[PDB]
């Protein structure tokens, strides 16, 4: 696409809109910056050049735009980017200007849980084919930081957020993993209006993967599935890998488990066919991927004690799957809390009963999660306070897990910093 002259207006000094400037001023376009936040975390970073607006949306300069550049973190029905698009003024995000100027085909992948795992997966499925990939999006590395000549195959991790804002995504395979409650501080409409977010992701995709499981997964020839007990790629069993009946992996081989882990390989196997690797290669690389930093990642054993950072179970759905049939020889120390964005934790409790299972809930919505199962609960402000206050009480077979159901961004940079901060109070109090 073609941007020259045209008055840019990026709303978002974090990653994305410092990925944004960068993008413009690379293509001639001085854009100008603002963000509600009076001290954004990238104000520093922003090149002295930009004009930039803190503290508020500055409606002067939306109402001028020729086009509007809206970070993930700002809803477009913030009254000020609302009435921008009731003038007509056209609104994208940093997702729509990668794929407008892309060159090498796009794997799209979204969901409540399981994206990056996912993503990462097919990424290496490609570089096992000697495929040059470029890999990002919600992830965490800015889509538009992947472009490259090069660069032949795409994958990109997709948030709802991200979604909304975009309209020229035409996947070579795309897949909504699973529909769980999140986001619904950003979503009034509740359950089906993020649903609808998610379900921008099909749109002109080659191949649609749906989760067989997950009705919700599902939009209106048939898309590929994946599912435990059906779908075009399924489980069988020892645990075997399957596609339409054909053994192809037993999971033994991989590093992964867990069944919704078994069932993101599956999704990732879908997704790598539909794009044409290979599959052999495909299988290689489920047999070395070991797992996310932060996703259910033991960061310490020792004294017959593990202590798992799961600081990326941000909703009520990853913190299910990693209780949901767990194995602690003694006592769970579960930590709990942060910003709940308005989900109902209600469904965690009936994991949450018998006599092995104490609660540490801490942040802005500790109070809640304590709610889940009062006589069993600690509540204090932070995290290090919860560990502290959990550490002495560590008996060996015990097992000290942070999956805190929630976003950390009330007390933290990002979650990799509270499930640093949680790695590093292990070691010290482990
Ligand atoms: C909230 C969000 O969508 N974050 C993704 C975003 O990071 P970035 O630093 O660009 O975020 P941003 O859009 O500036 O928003 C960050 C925070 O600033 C606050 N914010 C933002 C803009 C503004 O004017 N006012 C304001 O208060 C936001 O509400 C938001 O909570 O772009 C990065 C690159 O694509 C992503 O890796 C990053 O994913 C993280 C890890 C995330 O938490 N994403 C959510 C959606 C999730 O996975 O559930
Ligand atoms: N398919 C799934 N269903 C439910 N929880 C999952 C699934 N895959 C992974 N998890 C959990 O989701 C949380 C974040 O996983 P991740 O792969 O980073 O997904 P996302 O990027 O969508 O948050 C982690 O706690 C992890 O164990
Ligand atoms: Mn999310």
Redesign the pocket.
């Known amino acids: 696409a073609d941007y020259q002259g045209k008055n840019v207006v990026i709303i978002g000094l974090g990653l994305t809109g410092l990925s944004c400037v960068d993008f413009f001023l690379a293509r001639g376009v001085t854009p100008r910056v603002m963000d509600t936040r009076m001290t954004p975390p990238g104000l520093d970073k922003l090149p002295e050049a930009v004009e930039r607006h803190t503290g508020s949306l500055n409606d002067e300069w939306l109402m001028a735009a020729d086009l509007i550049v809206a970070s993930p973190g700002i809803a477009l029905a913030h009254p000020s980017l609302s009435a921008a698009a009731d003038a007509g003024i056209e609104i994208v995000g940093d997702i729509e200007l990668f794929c407008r100027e892309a060159q090498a085909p796009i794997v799209a992948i979204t ?8 993503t990462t997966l097919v990424g290496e499925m490609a570089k096992a084919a000697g495929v040059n990939v470029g890999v990002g999006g ?2 965490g590395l800015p889509a538009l930081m992947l472009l490259d000549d090069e660069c032949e195959l795409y994958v990109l ?1 997709l948030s709802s957020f991200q979604l909304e804002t975009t309209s020229s995504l035409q996947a070579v395979a795309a897949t909504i ?2 529909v769980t409650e999140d986001h619904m501080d950003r979503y009034p409409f509740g359950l089906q209006q993020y649903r609808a977010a998610k379900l921008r992701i099909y749109e002109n995709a080659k191949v649609c993967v749906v989760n067989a499981d997950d009705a919700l997964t599902m939009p209106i020839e048939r898309c590929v599935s994946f599912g435990v007990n059906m779908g075009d790629y399924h489980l069988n069993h020892e645990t075997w890998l399957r596609v339409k009946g054909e053994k192809v992996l037993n999971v033994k081989e991989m590093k992964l488990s867990g069944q ?2 078994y ?2 390989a599956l999704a990732a196997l879908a997704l790598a066919d539909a794009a044409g690797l290979p599959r052999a290669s495909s299988l290689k690389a489920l047999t070395t991927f070991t797992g ?1 930093p932060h ?2 990642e033991v960061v310490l054993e020792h004294n017959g004690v593990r202590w798992i950072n ?1 600081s ?3 909703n009520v ?2 913190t299910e ?2 209780l949901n049939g767990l194995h602690v020889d003694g006592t769970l120390h579960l930590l709990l809390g942060g910003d709940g964005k308005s989900a109902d934790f209600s469904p965690l409790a009936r994991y949450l009963n018998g006599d092995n299972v104490r609660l540490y809930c801490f942040g802005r919505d500790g109070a809640q999660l304590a709610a889940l199962r009062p006589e069993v609960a600690e509540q204090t402000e932070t995290m290090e306070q919860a560990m502290r206050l959990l550490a002495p009480r560590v008996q060996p077979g015990d097992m000290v897990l942070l ?1 805190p159901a929630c976003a950390s961004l009330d007390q933290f940079k990002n979650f990799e910093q509270r499930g640093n901060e949680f790695a590093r109070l292990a070691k010290e109090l482990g």
């Open positions: 969901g409540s849980n399981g994206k990056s795992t996912v919600n992830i991790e993993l699973n919704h882990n069932t993101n996310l996703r259910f799961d990326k179970a941000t759905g990853s799957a990693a999956s």
